[PDB]
Amino acid sequence: ITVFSPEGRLYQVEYAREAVRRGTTAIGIACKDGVVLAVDRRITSKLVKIRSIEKIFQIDDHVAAATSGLVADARVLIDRARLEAQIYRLTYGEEISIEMLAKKICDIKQAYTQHGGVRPFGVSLLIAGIDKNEARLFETDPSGALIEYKATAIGSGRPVVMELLEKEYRDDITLDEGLELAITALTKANEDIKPENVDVCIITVKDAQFKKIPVEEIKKLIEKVKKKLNEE
Amino acid sequence: ITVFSPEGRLYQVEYAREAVRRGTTAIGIACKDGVVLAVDRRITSKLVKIRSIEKIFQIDDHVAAATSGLVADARVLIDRARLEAQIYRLTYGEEISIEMLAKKICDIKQAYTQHGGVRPFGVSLLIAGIDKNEARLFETDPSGALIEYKATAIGSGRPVVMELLEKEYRDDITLDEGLELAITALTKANEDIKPENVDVCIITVKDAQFKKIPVEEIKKLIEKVKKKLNEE
Amino acid sequence: ITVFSPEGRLYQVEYAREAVRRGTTAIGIACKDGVVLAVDRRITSKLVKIRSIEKIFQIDDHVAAATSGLVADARVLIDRARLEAQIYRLTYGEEISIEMLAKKICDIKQAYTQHGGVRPFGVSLLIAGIDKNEARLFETDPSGALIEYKATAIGSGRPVVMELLEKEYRDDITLDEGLELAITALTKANEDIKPENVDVCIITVKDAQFKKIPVEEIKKLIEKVKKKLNEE
Amino acid sequence: ITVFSPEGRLYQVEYAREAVRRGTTAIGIACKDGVVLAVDRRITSKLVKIRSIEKIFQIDDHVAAATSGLVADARVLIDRARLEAQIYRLTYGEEISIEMLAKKICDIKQAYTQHGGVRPFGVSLLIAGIDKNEARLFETDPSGALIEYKATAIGSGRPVVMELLEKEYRDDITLDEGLELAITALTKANEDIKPENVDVCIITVKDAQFKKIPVEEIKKLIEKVKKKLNEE
Amino acid sequence: TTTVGLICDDAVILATDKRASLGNLVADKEAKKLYKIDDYIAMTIAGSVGDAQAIVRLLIAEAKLYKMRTGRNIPPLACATLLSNILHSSRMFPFLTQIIIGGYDLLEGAKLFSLDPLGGMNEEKTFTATGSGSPIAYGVLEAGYDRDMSVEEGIKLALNALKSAMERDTFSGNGISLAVITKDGVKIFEDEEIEKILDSMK
Amino acid sequence: TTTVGLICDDAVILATDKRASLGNLVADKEAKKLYKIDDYIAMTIAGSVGDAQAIVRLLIAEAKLYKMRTGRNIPPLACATLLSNILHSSRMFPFLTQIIIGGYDLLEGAKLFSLDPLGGMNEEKTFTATGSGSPIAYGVLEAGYDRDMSVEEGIKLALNALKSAMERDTFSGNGISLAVITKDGVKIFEDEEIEKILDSMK
């Protein structure tokens, strides 16, 4: 009562991807000094407190993840990873490995694919953290995702930046070096981004801990941007 | 045995959205002094005790919400919101946080999206109250909804006022400054509204409590109105 | 495996509605002295004991309801209201509240609407009684019904009287004042009604109790009627 | 609530087959010294840590398998073969018998074929281990697979090499003789494979143990390859 | 472990003893034994702590819910008849604990309900008490109670019951708490002020 | 098996005894009985190890979840009312063990809660202690404690409860552990530094 395709591919599954590439955009970036995420909410009307548009979720003291698709299946997938996460810390004592955490909820997404009477999750996810000194980043697909990026993006302007990064990125980039990376990138796909329409989460490996970024740090860096709309 | 779309969107879901854009109009408004709701019943025949057309429901001593869509699915969601809430209060003691309470029924509502043999709820909600000195307002969509407005509206006249408010609201507006806002707005979409066709429920933050407005306060404020149908 | 509409409405739901607008008529009227109900059975052939045509049911010493729609789903809903009614009295001791009894069977009917595999009920209801000195009236619909009337009607000639009442009713009318109301009304829709084709049941708030009306009382009052078919 | 065909064949299963011949290619080879596996990831973008593109899995200390098809159903079968692999070891003490372990998840695979509401797994497996001095290799099929090869391959370049091997294999070939066998073979289907686009896994029978091959062992062997593109 | 309820004219009074009694050891120098569930009703726990503990919470919710689902603040003699049922369910089961509930009925006025661990419920018209040292407290009332003894001559007599029991029962008697429910509300007395009274007494 | 909790001005002090007591046999010469569940909360286990043991892990995980799902670090008096609930689940069942939770409320200040196996909970405003050798430690407090004391005058009195009990209880009295929860955090005292104190003492 789900689906399968007439030749290689798979019905519903790919339709539910689209849901994502239509979704809000959001880039995740690795490095060596930690790892930071960021998303481009497209809050249009200004009657909606920006605090609510939840695009990035904490999952453990040391590992968090960012959404893109429908926020129907955003939440439910997190107060559930957030769940599969502490369970693990509980029947071991280990801050749950990130690769594992991923390999869990991405398996769940995968079961929802092949079972009678249940549409897959209209979402892809960006999980990053500190797997014991190793700050890493993953991308989930509404049907399994073994993709450990050094940096990527999902949603609206995927190819826009998912191909910007394609070049200049490098495996040494520092945090304040990747600082801009996402901001500049995110702007390419959003020609006119409010400076709070956006969300920044930092997780430095320098302490196995997750931090926020206040508004206007956002803007004061969205400034190194007017020098990018020139013969390029 | 529900549905999913052939390219990004989602069948039953949106069809059920409409059900809402067809239901009665409803406005919700935050502020800094608390928060106030109000709904335009369109009680046609005058043979119906206006007391039964429940369009707004208290969900705790400190948080309540207003309905828009089909009353079939109205009550059921609240006789069940009123429920997740008091459960919480007994497995903690804490008057249930508002962002959570939302993040519960707007979770169920999402669950009713992707599961064998069951139609999503024909409803959007407006949930407001006092989350510890912080008065806030939320919109739900028949499938997950992280939209925390400073103020908004749903129902028949969404675009009338959901695009009036677009301008003249202020992250300053008080309660009695927002007194009129909702009354005045609601008239826009309803030329000729009975004073009592309407409901008014005030939750001041100044006491974490929920109050009522009698008829004629309604009317005596639906009077600053005849000066709004002039060249505008 | 039920339904939902392609633009706001809902499939089976309304189709089930018609079933009612086709069924036998029935009027219930509130007042200030209690509350009275009545129904125009349309017993054609005279080979059927009229005592079997059940169209009004007692639900408790103080509350009773009248059926309209198919007699298949008539009984089942009542030999079950009759349950959710004595259940309450048992887990409290209180003669069950009428706005609660209603909101109950009316919540079930609702569930029958949105759930895989099962046809909603072909009946709208008329429920009334004495909620603690307060004699009230309620109408239900094959999917939720928050309608507490001062008086209304359903079935055959809904619009006949449901729009007769629409004028001359008064928030004052007494019991022996609503005496005629229903009777005259019911006659309007049914040109030529047998005098027992009809069923009368009076709950006075003057004792919290349920009474019956004998044939010929019915007739002798269907008498002030021949003065109504004159230039009106 | 799956499928069957109108004349012998079987709907979904073969549509699900395709999904494999579509996936990434993979080759496994037996012999007499052990047996070895290798796969051709087709990591296009160089933004993805080649470490997470998982295409070969270990199942026990003495047995392992390589994927092909969709990875959603890659993991779920292995962290499910991995299980039934240690279950056995616990209810006997015997390193589970390769022939049996295979006969297991392939059964599973089959059962998903004839059961209401669930799509067969989009994957063929290449299982290889040391079954008591007897090193062997099997190919699974999205619905049963009693095939014990002396070498084979799955996926993309199925025909290219599953018909190259067709000739020059020998029930003699050594390990370092099957060295190039799968590399050269693999090259045929992928004109231009990166030298790390490939994984290598060696299970010598002479220690019942499973080993890795480092990069540029990979390359320094993909070199005996340029002398393969000449009038042939 | 010792509490007291009585009806006196207008409304209803309740009192306890903030003493917790871990077998030989005195465990809590101030243990709450009097709870308000609804703006109009309040109750008193006697006996199994963590048991009566839950029954509170696993009842307060049910109130500030009925209240909501139907306006009228769960009329007391209804809410009571919940416990008679909330208890009796665990008869087949190991429930246990004492309890007094009192509140001012929307209309019917003041009400006072005793209650056993099984589920036996009884409306007390006069005065009733419960707690390790209850029978002490009891003598007091049953030779210190008249049909109509003022809003004062009740909360006096109330204390005095505890005064006795508290100092003639191994288990009761550490500090004291009290509230009086009446039409317009429910008053939890902040320790300090209670005191005034027995100062103004003997 | 012996713990102490007490409020002294700013925050709250907790201490235990690293002694595992396997019947006649001294089993552990250093067994934790003091755990920090959240950055603002921490606790002391007394009694059935393997039972409290799980009750810790089968809890921290419920904290470092609530913290996430809703920012606020599980407000202590809330996390407590879990245990009250968590335990009582196993009333119908075999549960058991003691417990003190001591942590700083984001706003409401310092909090100290006591907890019996069934599910009985009380907020201890002053001081409370539990363990095999509790009533020994107790006596110490009940005659060496003043509303105000100090940050210092607390951790002193603190040890000196254990000091008695630990040498007057067959079951308590091997090594000692101590942490203090205050607004800005929770300090586990690394043994060596603990010692400093009774040196500077008598």
CSV table of C-alpha atoms in Angstrom, one decimal, chain D:
chain,number,residue,atom,x,y,z
D,1,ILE,CA,-1.4,-6.2,-1.0
D,2,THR,CA,1.9,-6.7,-3.0
D,3,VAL,CA,1.7,-8.4,-6.4
D,4,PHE,CA,1.8,-11.5,-8.7
D,5,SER,CA,2.0,-11.8,-12.5
D,6,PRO,CA,-0.6,-12.7,-15.3
D,7,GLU,CA,1.6,-15.5,-16.6
D,8,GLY,CA,4.5,-16.9,-14.5
D,9,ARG,CA,6.6,-13.8,-13.8
D,10,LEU,CA,6.2,-11.5,-10.8
D,11,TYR,CA,5.4,-7.8,-10.8
D,12,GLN,CA,7.2,-5.8,-8.1
D,13,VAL,CA,10.1,-8.3,-7.7
D,14,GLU,CA,11.5,-7.6,-11.1
D,15,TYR,CA,10.8,-4.0,-11.1
D,16,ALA,CA,12.8,-4.2,-7.9
D,17,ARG,CA,15.5,-6.2,-9.6
D,18,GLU,CA,16.0,-3.3,-12.1
D,19,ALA,CA,16.8,-1.0,-9.2
D,20,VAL,CA,19.8,-3.1,-8.6
D,21,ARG,CA,21.2,-3.4,-12.2
D,22,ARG,CA,20.8,0.4,-11.9
D,23,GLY,CA,22.8,0.8,-8.7
D,24,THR,CA,26.6,0.7,-8.3
D,25,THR,CA,28.5,-2.2,-9.7
D,26,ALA,CA,30.3,-4.7,-7.5
D,27,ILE,CA,32.5,-7.8,-8.0
D,28,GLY,CA,33.3,-10.7,-5.6
D,29,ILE,CA,35.6,-13.6,-6.3
D,30,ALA,CA,36.3,-17.0,-4.7
D,31,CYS,CA,39.3,-19.3,-5.1
D,32,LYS,CA,41.3,-21.4,-2.8
D,33,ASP,CA,43.3,-18.9,-0.7
D,34,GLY,CA,40.3,-17.1,0.6
D,35,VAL,CA,38.1,-14.7,-1.5
D,36,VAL,CA,37.9,-11.0,-2.1
D,37,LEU,CA,35.5,-8.2,-2.7
D,38,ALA,CA,35.6,-4.8,-4.4
D,39,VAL,CA,33.0,-2.3,-5.5
D,40,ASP,CA,33.0,0.8,-7.7
D,41,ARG,CA,31.5,3.8,-5.8
D,42,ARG,CA,30.8,6.5,-8.4
D,43,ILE,CA,31.5,9.4,-6.1
D,44,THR,CA,31.0,12.2,-8.6
D,45,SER,CA,31.2,15.4,-6.5
D,46,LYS,CA,34.4,15.4,-4.4
D,47,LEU,CA,32.6,17.1,-1.5
D,48,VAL,CA,31.8,13.8,0.2
D,49,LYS,CA,34.1,12.0,2.6
D,50,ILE,CA,34.6,8.8,0.8
D,51,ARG,CA,34.6,7.0,4.1
D,52,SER,CA,30.9,7.2,4.6
D,53,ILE,CA,29.9,5.9,1.2
D,54,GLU,CA,29.4,2.5,2.7
D,55,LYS,CA,29.4,-0.4,0.0
D,56,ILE,CA,31.0,-3.3,1.9
D,57,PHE,CA,30.0,-4.6,5.3
D,58,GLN,CA,31.5,-7.1,7.7
D,59,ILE,CA,29.0,-9.6,9.2
D,60,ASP,CA,31.2,-11.5,11.7
D,61,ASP,CA,34.9,-12.0,12.4
D,62,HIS,CA,35.0,-14.5,9.5
D,63,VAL,CA,32.3,-13.3,7.2
D,64,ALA,CA,31.3,-10.3,5.2
D,65,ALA,CA,29.2,-8.9,2.3
D,66,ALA,CA,29.0,-6.1,-0.3
D,67,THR,CA,26.0,-4.1,-1.3
D,68,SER,CA,24.3,-3.0,-4.6
D,69,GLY,CA,20.8,-1.5,-5.1
D,70,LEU,CA,19.5,1.4,-2.9
D,71,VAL,CA,21.4,2.0,0.4
D,72,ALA,CA,18.2,2.7,2.3
D,73,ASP,CA,17.7,-1.1,2.1
D,74,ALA,CA,21.5,-1.7,2.3
D,75,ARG,CA,22.1,-1.1,6.0
D,76,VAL,CA,18.7,-2.4,7.2
D,77,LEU,CA,19.6,-5.8,5.8
D,78,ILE,CA,23.1,-5.9,7.2
D,79,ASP,CA,22.3,-4.5,10.8
D,80,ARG,CA,19.8,-7.3,10.4
D,81,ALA,CA,22.1,-9.9,8.9
D,82,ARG,CA,24.7,-8.8,11.5
D,83,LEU,CA,22.0,-9.6,14.1
D,84,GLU,CA,20.9,-13.0,12.9
D,85,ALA,CA,24.6,-13.6,12.6
D,86,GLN,CA,25.4,-13.3,16.3
D,87,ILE,CA,22.1,-14.8,17.5
D,88,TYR,CA,23.1,-18.0,15.9
D,89,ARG,CA,26.6,-17.8,17.6
D,90,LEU,CA,24.8,-17.4,20.9
D,91,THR,CA,22.5,-20.4,20.6
D,92,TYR,CA,25.2,-22.8,19.6
D,93,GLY,CA,28.6,-21.2,19.9
D,94,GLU,CA,29.4,-21.9,16.3
D,95,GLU,CA,30.7,-19.0,14.1
D,96,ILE,CA,27.6,-19.1,12.0
D,97,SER,CA,27.8,-21.3,8.9
D,98,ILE,CA,28.0,-19.1,5.8
D,99,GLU,CA,25.6,-21.2,3.8
D,100,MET,CA,23.1,-20.8,6.7
D,101,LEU,CA,23.6,-17.1,7.3
D,102,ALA,CA,22.9,-16.4,3.6
D,103,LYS,CA,20.0,-18.8,3.5
D,104,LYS,CA,18.6,-16.6,6.3
D,105,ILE,CA,18.4,-13.0,5.1
D,106,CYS,CA,17.6,-14.3,1.6
D,107,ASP,CA,14.6,-16.1,3.2
D,108,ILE,CA,13.7,-12.8,4.9
D,109,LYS,CA,14.1,-11.2,1.5
D,110,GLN,CA,11.7,-13.7,0.1
D,111,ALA,CA,9.1,-13.3,2.7
D,112,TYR,CA,8.8,-9.6,2.0
D,113,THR,CA,7.9,-10.7,-1.4
D,114,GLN,CA,4.7,-12.6,-0.7
D,115,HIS,CA,3.2,-10.5,2.0
D,116,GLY,CA,0.5,-7.9,2.0
D,117,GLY,CA,1.9,-4.3,2.0
D,118,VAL,CA,5.6,-4.2,1.6
D,119,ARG,CA,8.0,-3.8,-1.2
D,120,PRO,CA,10.8,-6.3,-1.8
D,121,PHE,CA,14.3,-5.1,-1.0
D,122,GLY,CA,16.0,-3.3,-3.8
D,123,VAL,CA,19.3,-5.1,-3.4
D,124,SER,CA,21.5,-8.0,-4.5
D,125,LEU,CA,24.2,-9.1,-2.0
D,126,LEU,CA,27.7,-10.4,-2.3
D,127,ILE,CA,28.4,-12.5,0.8
D,128,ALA,CA,31.9,-13.9,1.4
D,129,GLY,CA,33.6,-15.8,4.3
D,130,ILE,CA,35.6,-18.7,5.7
D,131,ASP,CA,33.2,-21.6,6.4
D,132,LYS,CA,35.7,-23.9,8.1
D,133,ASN,CA,38.7,-23.8,5.7
D,134,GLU,CA,36.1,-23.5,2.9
D,135,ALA,CA,36.1,-19.9,1.6
D,136,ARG,CA,32.9,-19.2,-0.4
D,137,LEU,CA,30.9,-16.4,-2.1
D,138,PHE,CA,27.1,-16.0,-2.7
D,139,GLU,CA,24.9,-13.6,-4.7
D,140,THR,CA,21.5,-12.7,-3.2
D,141,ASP,CA,18.4,-11.7,-5.2
D,142,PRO,CA,15.3,-9.5,-4.2
D,143,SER,CA,13.5,-12.8,-3.7
D,144,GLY,CA,15.6,-15.9,-2.9
D,145,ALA,CA,19.1,-16.8,-4.1
D,146,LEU,CA,20.5,-20.2,-4.1
D,147,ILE,CA,23.7,-19.0,-6.1
D,148,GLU,CA,27.2,-20.0,-4.9
D,149,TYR,CA,29.5,-18.4,-7.4
D,150,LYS,CA,33.2,-19.0,-8.1
D,151,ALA,CA,33.2,-15.3,-8.8
D,152,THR,CA,30.5,-12.8,-10.0
D,153,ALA,CA,29.3,-9.2,-9.8
D,154,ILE,CA,26.2,-7.1,-9.5
D,155,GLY,CA,24.8,-3.7,-10.4
D,156,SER,CA,25.8,-1.2,-13.1
D,157,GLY,CA,28.3,-3.1,-15.1
D,158,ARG,CA,26.7,-6.4,-14.5
D,159,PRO,CA,26.8,-7.7,-18.1
D,160,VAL,CA,30.2,-6.0,-18.9
D,161,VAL,CA,32.1,-8.2,-16.4
D,162,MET,CA,29.6,-10.8,-15.3
D,163,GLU,CA,30.4,-11.8,-18.9
D,164,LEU,CA,34.1,-10.9,-18.8
D,165,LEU,CA,34.6,-13.3,-15.9
D,166,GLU,CA,32.6,-15.6,-18.1
D,167,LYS,CA,35.8,-16.9,-19.7
D,168,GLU,CA,39.3,-16.3,-18.1
D,169,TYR,CA,38.4,-17.3,-14.5
D,170,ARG,CA,40.0,-20.6,-13.3
D,171,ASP,CA,39.1,-22.9,-10.4
D,172,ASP,CA,42.7,-22.3,-9.7
D,173,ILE,CA,43.2,-18.5,-9.6
D,174,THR,CA,45.0,-17.4,-6.5
D,175,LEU,CA,44.4,-14.3,-4.2
D,176,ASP,CA,47.1,-12.1,-5.8
D,177,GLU,CA,46.0,-13.7,-9.0
D,178,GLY,CA,42.4,-12.6,-8.5
D,179,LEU,CA,44.2,-9.4,-7.4
D,180,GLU,CA,43.8,-7.7,-10.8
D,181,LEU,CA,40.9,-10.0,-11.8
D,182,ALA,CA,38.3,-7.6,-10.1
D,183,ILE,CA,40.2,-4.4,-10.5
D,184,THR,CA,40.8,-4.8,-14.3
D,185,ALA,CA,37.2,-6.2,-14.6
D,186,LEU,CA,35.9,-3.2,-12.6
D,187,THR,CA,37.8,-0.8,-15.0
D,188,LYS,CA,36.0,-2.1,-18.1
D,189,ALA,CA,32.6,-1.0,-16.9
D,190,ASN,CA,34.0,2.3,-15.5
D,191,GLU,CA,36.2,4.0,-18.0
D,192,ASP,CA,37.8,6.4,-15.5
D,193,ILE,CA,37.5,5.2,-12.0
D,194,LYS,CA,39.2,7.3,-9.3
D,195,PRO,CA,41.8,5.3,-7.2
D,196,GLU,CA,39.7,5.5,-4.0
D,197,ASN,CA,36.4,5.4,-5.7
D,198,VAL,CA,36.9,1.7,-4.9
D,199,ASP,CA,37.0,-0.4,-1.7
D,200,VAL,CA,38.9,-3.6,-1.2
D,201,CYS,CA,38.3,-6.3,1.4
D,202,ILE,CA,40.3,-9.5,1.7
D,203,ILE,CA,39.4,-12.6,3.7
D,204,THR,CA,42.3,-15.0,3.5
D,205,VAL,CA,41.2,-18.5,4.5
D,206,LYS,CA,44.5,-18.9,6.1
D,207,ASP,CA,43.5,-17.2,9.3
D,208,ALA,CA,39.7,-16.9,8.9
D,209,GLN,CA,40.2,-13.3,9.1
D,210,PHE,CA,39.1,-10.1,7.2
D,211,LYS,CA,41.5,-7.4,6.1
D,212,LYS,CA,41.6,-4.0,4.3
D,213,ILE,CA,43.5,-2.6,1.3
D,214,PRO,CA,44.9,0.9,1.5
D,215,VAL,CA,44.6,3.5,-1.2
D,216,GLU,CA,47.1,3.4,-4.1
D,217,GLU,CA,47.4,-0.2,-3.7
D,218,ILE,CA,44.1,0.3,-5.4
D,219,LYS,CA,45.8,2.7,-7.9
D,220,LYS,CA,49.1,1.0,-8.3
D,221,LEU,CA,47.0,-1.9,-9.6
D,222,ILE,CA,44.6,0.2,-11.7
D,223,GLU,CA,47.7,0.9,-13.6
D,224,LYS,CA,47.9,-2.5,-15.3
D,225,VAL,CA,44.9,-1.1,-17.2
D,226,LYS,CA,46.3,1.3,-19.8
D,227,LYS,CA,47.7,-1.8,-21.6
D,228,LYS,CA,44.1,-3.0,-21.8
D,229,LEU,CA,42.8,-0.3,-24.1
D,230,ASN,CA,44.4,-1.5,-27.4
D,231,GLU,CA,42.6,-3.2,-30.3
D,232,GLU,CA,40.7,-5.2,-27.7
